[PDB]
Short mmCIF file of C-alpha atoms in Angstrom, two decimals:
data_model
loop_
_atom_site.label_atom_id
_atom_site.label_comp_id
_atom_site.label_asym_id
_atom_site.label_seq_id
_atom_site.Cartn_x
_atom_site.Cartn_y
_atom_site.Cartn_z
CA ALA I 1 51.10 70.49 75.78
CA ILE I 2 50.32 68.02 78.60
CA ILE I 3 49.49 70.63 81.32
CA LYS I 4 49.00 74.25 80.26
CA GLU I 5 48.66 77.05 82.78
CA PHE I 6 45.22 77.06 82.19
CA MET I 7 42.99 74.04 81.94
CA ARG I 8 39.61 72.98 81.60
CA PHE I 9 37.90 69.74 83.16
CA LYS I 10 34.79 67.85 82.97
CA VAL I 11 33.56 65.75 85.70
CA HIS I 12 30.76 62.95 85.98
CA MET I 13 29.70 61.62 89.64
CA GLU I 14 27.49 58.40 90.04
CA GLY I 15 26.53 58.20 93.74
CA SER I 16 24.17 57.11 96.43
CA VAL I 17 24.00 58.47 100.01
CA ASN I 18 21.67 56.02 102.10
CA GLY I 19 20.44 54.71 99.13
CA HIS I 20 19.13 57.89 97.35
CA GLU I 21 21.06 57.15 93.78
CA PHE I 22 21.94 60.14 92.01
CA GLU I 23 24.32 61.60 89.02
CA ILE I 24 25.95 64.85 88.61
CA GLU I 25 27.81 66.33 85.51
CA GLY I 26 30.32 69.45 85.71
CA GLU I 27 32.72 71.39 83.86
CA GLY I 28 35.36 73.49 85.78
CA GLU I 29 38.59 75.41 84.73
CA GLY I 30 41.84 76.72 86.72
CA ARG I 31 45.26 77.27 86.85
CA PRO I 32 47.10 74.11 87.50
CA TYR I 33 50.30 75.79 88.69
CA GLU I 34 48.81 78.55 90.84
CA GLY I 35 46.35 76.09 92.88
CA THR I 36 43.03 77.61 91.93
CA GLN I 37 40.05 75.96 90.31
CA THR I 38 36.25 76.88 89.94
CA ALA I 39 33.66 74.44 88.68
CA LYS I 40 29.96 74.49 87.95
CA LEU I 41 28.06 71.26 88.57
CA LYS I 42 24.64 70.19 87.86
CA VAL I 43 22.49 67.40 89.27
CA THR I 44 21.39 65.21 86.20
CA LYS I 45 19.66 62.32 88.20
CA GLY I 46 18.11 62.14 91.53
CA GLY I 47 17.48 65.81 92.26
CA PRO I 48 16.81 67.60 94.11
CA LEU I 49 19.01 65.94 96.55
CA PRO I 50 17.68 65.27 100.00
CA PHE I 51 21.26 65.26 101.74
CA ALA I 52 23.90 68.04 102.41
CA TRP I 53 25.74 69.53 99.03
CA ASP I 54 28.84 69.83 101.44
CA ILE I 55 29.66 66.05 101.59
CA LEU I 56 29.89 65.82 97.61
CA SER I 57 32.02 69.37 97.12
CA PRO I 58 35.45 67.87 98.02
CA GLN I 59 34.82 65.17 95.51
CA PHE I 60 34.90 67.18 92.46
CA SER I 61 40.91 67.94 91.67
CA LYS I 62 44.30 67.55 92.80
CA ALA I 63 46.18 68.27 89.40
CA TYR I 64 45.42 71.95 90.56
CA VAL I 65 47.69 72.30 93.31
CA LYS I 66 50.44 74.47 93.63
CA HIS I 67 53.90 73.00 94.59
CA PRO I 68 57.12 74.33 95.45
CA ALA I 69 59.82 73.85 92.82
CA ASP I 70 61.72 71.28 94.61
CA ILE I 71 58.56 68.76 95.64
CA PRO I 72 57.86 66.21 92.81
CA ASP I 73 54.16 67.11 91.75
CA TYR I 74 53.32 63.34 91.72
CA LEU I 75 49.64 64.07 90.31
CA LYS I 76 50.80 66.10 87.71
CA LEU I 77 53.57 63.82 86.63
CA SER I 78 51.19 61.21 86.23
CA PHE I 79 49.48 62.81 83.07
CA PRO I 80 48.50 62.08 80.46
CA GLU I 81 47.36 59.01 81.58
CA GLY I 82 46.72 60.09 84.94
CA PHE I 83 45.89 58.55 88.32
CA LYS I 84 43.26 57.31 90.68
CA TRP I 85 42.31 57.77 94.06
CA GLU I 86 40.01 56.27 96.68
CA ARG I 87 39.12 57.91 99.74
CA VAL I 88 37.22 57.13 102.83
CA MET I 89 35.48 59.69 105.24
CA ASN I 90 34.49 58.84 108.66
CA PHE I 91 32.03 61.55 110.03
CA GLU I 92 31.81 61.94 113.92
CA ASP I 93 27.92 60.68 113.92
CA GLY I 94 28.61 57.34 112.22
CA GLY I 95 28.14 58.71 108.54
CA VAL I 96 30.66 56.80 106.10
CA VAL I 97 31.58 57.90 102.66
CA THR I 98 33.87 56.19 100.18
CA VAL I 99 34.77 57.68 96.74
CA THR I 100 36.62 56.36 94.14
CA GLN I 101 37.78 58.51 91.14
CA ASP I 102 39.44 58.19 87.73
CA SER I 103 41.43 61.20 86.26
CA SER I 104 42.98 61.59 82.95
CA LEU I 105 43.84 64.03 80.11
CA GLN I 106 42.09 63.75 76.61
CA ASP I 107 42.04 66.43 74.08
CA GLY I 108 43.49 68.97 76.41
CA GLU I 109 41.14 68.68 79.22
CA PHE I 110 41.07 66.86 82.63
CA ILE I 111 38.20 63.96 82.48
CA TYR I 112 37.31 63.14 86.18
CA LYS I 113 34.97 60.28 86.74
CA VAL I 114 33.70 59.65 90.46
CA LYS I 115 31.82 56.97 92.11
CA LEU I 116 30.45 57.88 95.50
CA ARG I 117 28.59 55.86 98.35
CA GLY I 118 27.52 57.53 101.47
CA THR I 119 25.92 54.96 104.35
CA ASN I 120 24.84 55.40 107.76
CA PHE I 121 24.10 59.06 108.15
CA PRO I 122 21.76 59.64 110.98
CA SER I 123 18.26 60.75 109.63
CA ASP I 124 18.37 63.34 112.37
CA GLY I 125 21.91 64.63 111.81
CA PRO I 126 23.04 67.51 109.96
CA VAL I 127 23.72 65.66 106.32
CA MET I 128 20.20 64.51 106.18
CA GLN I 129 18.65 67.61 107.39
CA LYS I 130 20.84 70.01 105.33
CA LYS I 131 22.31 71.77 108.30
CA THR I 132 25.78 72.33 106.93
CA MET I 133 27.74 75.65 105.80
CA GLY I 134 30.70 74.79 103.96
CA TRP I 135 34.27 73.24 105.07
CA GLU I 136 36.51 75.15 107.27
CA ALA I 137 39.86 75.40 105.56
CA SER I 138 41.75 72.20 105.88
CA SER I 139 45.55 70.80 105.89
CA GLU I 140 46.02 67.52 104.22
CA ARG I 141 49.28 65.58 105.52
CA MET I 142 50.68 63.93 102.69
CA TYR I 143 53.20 60.99 102.84
CA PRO I 144 54.43 57.97 100.52
CA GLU I 145 53.78 54.47 101.45
CA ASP I 146 53.40 51.28 99.38
CA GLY I 147 54.24 53.28 96.28
CA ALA I 148 51.33 55.20 96.50
CA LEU I 149 50.77 58.76 97.65
CA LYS I 150 48.51 58.97 100.86
CA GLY I 151 46.75 61.94 102.28
CA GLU I 152 45.22 62.29 105.80
CA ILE I 153 42.84 65.10 106.87
CA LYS I 154 40.77 66.38 109.70
CA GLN I 155 38.13 68.02 108.05
CA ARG I 156 35.61 70.10 109.72
CA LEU I 157 32.04 71.27 108.42
CA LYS I 158 30.38 74.38 109.94
CA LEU I 159 26.96 74.28 110.83
CA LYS I 160 24.30 76.71 109.98
CA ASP I 161 23.66 76.67 113.95
CA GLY I 162 27.06 77.81 114.63
CA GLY I 163 29.50 75.06 115.62
CA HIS I 164 31.17 71.95 114.31
CA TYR I 165 30.98 68.67 112.55
CA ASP I 166 34.09 66.69 112.21
CA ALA I 167 35.33 64.07 109.66
CA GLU I 168 38.44 61.95 109.38
CA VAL I 169 39.49 61.55 105.92
CA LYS I 170 42.06 59.30 104.17
CA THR I 171 42.93 59.01 100.71
CA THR I 172 45.32 56.90 98.69
CA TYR I 173 46.30 58.51 95.18
CA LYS I 174 47.95 56.43 92.93
CA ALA I 175 49.58 57.07 89.37
CA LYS I 176 48.50 54.70 86.40
CA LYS I 177 52.04 54.33 85.59
CA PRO I 178 55.09 54.21 87.99
CA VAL I 179 55.95 57.93 89.04
CA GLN I 180 58.60 59.04 91.65
CA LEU I 181 57.07 59.98 95.00
CA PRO I 182 57.67 63.06 97.12
CA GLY I 183 58.60 63.18 100.71
CA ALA I 184 56.19 64.30 103.48
CA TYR I 185 54.37 67.38 103.01
CA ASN I 186 51.33 69.29 103.60
CA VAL I 187 48.73 70.98 101.45
CA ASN I 188 46.75 73.58 102.50
CA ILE I 189 42.99 73.69 101.08
CA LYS I 190 40.21 75.90 101.08
CA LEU I 191 36.77 75.06 99.37
CA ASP I 192 34.13 77.85 98.82
CA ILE I 193 30.61 77.44 97.67
CA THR I 194 30.40 80.43 95.21
CA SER I 195 26.70 80.26 94.14
CA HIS I 196 23.78 78.02 94.24
CA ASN I 197 19.94 77.90 93.11
CA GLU I 198 17.63 77.24 95.99
CA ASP I 199 17.69 73.32 96.02
CA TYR I 200 21.38 72.92 94.92
CA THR I 201 20.75 71.40 91.48
CA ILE I 202 23.23 73.98 90.18
CA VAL I 203 26.11 74.79 92.18
CA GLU I 204 29.53 76.60 91.71
CA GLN I 205 32.43 75.97 93.68
CA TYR I 206 35.92 77.59 94.13
CA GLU I 207 38.98 75.79 95.54
CA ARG I 208 42.70 76.98 96.62
CA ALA I 209 45.16 74.46 97.34
CA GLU I 210 48.76 75.02 98.28
CA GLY I 211 51.61 72.43 98.79
CA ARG I 212 54.16 73.42 101.47
CA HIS I 213 57.09 71.64 103.24
CA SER I 214 56.31 70.40 106.46
CA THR I 215 60.03 70.10 107.69
CA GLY I 216 63.29 72.10 106.79
CA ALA E 1 70.79 70.78 94.63
CA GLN E 2 67.79 68.12 93.81
CA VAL E 3 68.40 68.77 90.15
CA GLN E 4 71.83 69.52 88.39
CA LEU E 5 72.09 70.38 84.62
CA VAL E 6 74.77 70.52 82.40
CA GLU E 7 74.53 71.63 78.79
CA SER E 8 76.84 70.99 76.03
CA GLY E 9 77.57 71.08 72.47
CA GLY E 10 78.01 74.60 72.01
CA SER E 11 80.03 75.52 68.74
CA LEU E 12 80.29 77.72 65.86
CA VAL E 13 78.59 76.39 62.64
CA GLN E 14 78.12 77.89 59.49
CA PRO E 15 74.66 79.09 58.26
CA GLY E 16 72.38 76.53 57.15
CA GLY E 17 74.67 73.96 59.28
CA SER E 18 73.39 71.90 62.05
CA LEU E 19 74.18 71.41 65.76
CA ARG E 20 73.27 68.82 68.27
CA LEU E 21 72.93 70.04 71.96
CA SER E 22 72.43 67.91 74.95
CA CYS E 23 71.57 68.71 78.61
CA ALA E 24 72.23 65.99 81.23
CA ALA E 25 69.95 65.95 84.36
CA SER E 26 71.64 64.42 87.61
CA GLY E 27 70.40 64.43 91.00
CA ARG E 28 67.50 62.68 92.91
CA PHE E 29 64.92 64.24 90.96
CA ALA E 30 66.41 64.23 87.34
CA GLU E 31 63.97 61.16 86.59
CA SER E 32 61.21 63.40 86.92
CA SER E 33 62.59 66.44 85.48
CA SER E 34 60.89 68.08 82.51
CA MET E 35 63.49 70.19 80.46
CA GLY E 36 63.06 73.03 78.37
CA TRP E 37 65.46 74.79 76.18
CA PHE E 38 65.64 78.80 76.34
CA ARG E 39 68.00 80.80 74.45
CA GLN E 40 69.50 84.32 75.15
CA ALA E 41 71.27 86.57 72.57
CA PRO E 42 73.28 89.28 73.42
CA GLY E 43 71.54 92.20 74.67
CA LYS E 44 68.07 90.51 74.15
CA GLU E 45 65.29 88.74 76.14
CA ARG E 46 65.47 84.92 77.14
CA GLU E 47 63.22 83.23 74.62
CA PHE E 48 61.36 79.69 74.50
CA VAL E 49 62.63 77.00 72.09
CA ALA E 50 61.67 73.56 72.97
CA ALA E 51 60.46 71.43 76.03
CA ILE E 52 60.12 67.83 76.52
CA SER E 53 58.46 65.80 79.11
CA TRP E 54 60.21 63.91 82.07
CA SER E 55 58.92 60.73 80.14
CA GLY E 56 60.11 61.59 76.77
CA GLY E 57 56.55 61.23 75.48
CA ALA E 58 55.29 64.93 75.06
CA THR E 59 57.26 67.61 73.06
CA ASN E 60 56.30 71.23 72.73
CA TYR E 61 58.21 73.60 70.11
CA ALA E 62 58.45 77.44 69.42
CA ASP E 63 57.08 78.64 66.18
CA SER E 64 60.76 79.24 65.03
CA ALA E 65 61.84 75.82 66.05
CA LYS E 66 59.03 73.67 64.47
CA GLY E 67 60.07 71.85 61.02
CA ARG E 68 63.68 72.30 61.78
CA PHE E 69 64.57 71.45 65.49
CA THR E 70 63.98 67.80 67.04
CA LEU E 71 64.09 67.38 71.12
CA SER E 72 64.51 63.66 72.29
CA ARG E 73 65.34 62.31 75.68
CA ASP E 74 67.29 59.31 76.66
CA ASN E 75 65.57 58.21 79.59
CA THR E 76 68.68 55.83 80.47
CA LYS E 77 70.87 59.12 81.28
CA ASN E 78 68.29 61.59 82.10
CA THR E 79 69.68 63.37 78.94
CA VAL E 80 67.90 65.51 76.67
CA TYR E 81 68.89 66.05 73.03
CA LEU E 82 68.31 69.43 70.81
CA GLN E 83 68.82 68.50 67.24
CA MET E 84 69.02 71.95 65.55
CA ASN E 85 68.75 72.13 61.75
CA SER E 86 68.88 74.89 59.19
CA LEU E 87 70.70 77.47 61.69
CA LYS E 88 70.70 81.06 60.69
CA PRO E 89 72.84 84.20 62.20
CA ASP E 90 70.02 85.19 64.22
CA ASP E 91 70.24 81.80 66.00
CA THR E 92 73.51 82.94 67.27
CA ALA E 93 73.11 82.92 71.42
CA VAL E 94 73.42 81.17 74.84
CA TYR E 95 71.14 78.11 74.81
CA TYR E 96 70.10 77.31 78.44
CA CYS E 97 68.35 73.99 79.73
CA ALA E 98 65.92 74.31 82.63
CA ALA E 99 64.09 71.97 84.35
CA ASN E 100 60.89 71.39 86.61
CA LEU E 101 59.31 68.57 88.55
CA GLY E 102 55.67 69.34 87.45
CA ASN E 103 55.47 68.14 83.88
CA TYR E 104 55.54 71.55 82.58
CA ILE E 105 56.91 72.16 78.99
CA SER E 106 55.89 75.83 77.93
CA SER E 107 57.40 78.90 77.80
CA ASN E 108 56.72 80.62 81.36
CA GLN E 109 60.49 80.62 82.59
CA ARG E 110 59.26 81.24 85.88
CA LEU E 111 57.79 77.69 86.15
CA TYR E 112 61.36 76.15 85.57
CA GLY E 113 63.13 75.87 89.18
CA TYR E 114 66.42 74.59 87.92
CA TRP E 115 68.86 76.11 85.22
CA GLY E 116 71.99 74.97 83.75
CA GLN E 117 74.97 77.46 82.64
CA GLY E 118 74.14 77.64 79.21
CA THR E 119 76.33 76.99 76.23
CA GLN E 120 77.37 79.13 73.34
CA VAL E 121 76.14 78.68 70.04
CA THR E 122 77.53 80.96 67.04
CA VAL E 123 76.26 80.93 63.56
CA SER E 124 78.38 82.45 60.88
#
C-alpha cells in the first residue's frame, strides 16, 4: 500500500550543463525489494543535448535498492512523504555537477523531481565531446552523519577510446521526517544504457542496486 | 536479534465473538518495524491477514479481514493490536506476527525477516 513489490515512477529533470538549459521527462518501473529498475527518458526541451548522456544517467532512484533484512532501509522507510537528496560530483578534468532531488509517493507511484547544474566541463573533454561509453559498476559507501545518510562513490566512466574518466561523488540523503538511520554499509550498483536513439533524445536505462554489510 | 516479537491474546471464543491480539516489538529496530499478521491453520498454508507500517500510518488488509478486523499501532510501545470481530470456526489458527525494516505491509512472507512464536486462536 505504501511500497509494492512492483512500483512505477515518474521523473522530471530541469538542468543546465555549461549553460545549456534542458528538460527531461521519464517514466520507469522496477522491483524495489529486488533492487532492479528500468526507465525510459525523453528530452523535452534543449534537445538534442551537446553533452554526454552519461553525466545525467545516475540522477534518474534509491527506493529500488535491495537491502538485507537486518539493515533498516532508510529511504523506503521515509515514504509516503519521502526524502530529498543532494549530490556533488567532481570530475577529474574540472567538470562539476551538483544535483538536488525530491522523492515522494503519490497515488501509488514514485514521483521524482531533479534539478541539475553542470559547470566547468572542458570544451575538449569527453563530456562535451560525447566520448563516453557508460559507467563501470560502482560501490557506494554509506554511513550516517548529522541525522542524514551519506554516500560516497569513486565512479568511473568508460571512454569510447578505451580507458577511463573518474569522478568523486558524495551524496546526502535526508528523510522528510525523522527516520532511524542504519550503520555503515555498501551498495553495489550497475547502471546500463539498454537502448537509445541516434542523438539520445530517447534513452532507456537499467539499474541493479544491492546493499551489503561492509562489516561482520 | 535486532527485533524480537511477542504475540499475545490467543484464546477460545464463540462463533460471532471477538478477540484482540497484540504483538509487542522490542530491540534496536523495533521503532522501524512494519508488522504483519499471518495465520496458519492445522495442516494448511500460512496466509496473510493484515499489516501496518512502522509509523502506524498505513494499513493493508486481506479481503477476509476487511470490514471486520482492525489493525492499529501504539508507537510508544512499538506494539500492534489486531481487533478481530465476527469470528467463525474457520478463523481457528495459530496467528503469527512478523516484521520487516523496509516499510513492506503486504502478503509476501519472504519479505518479513523476523517472526514471533505465534498465539493460538480457537473459535467454537
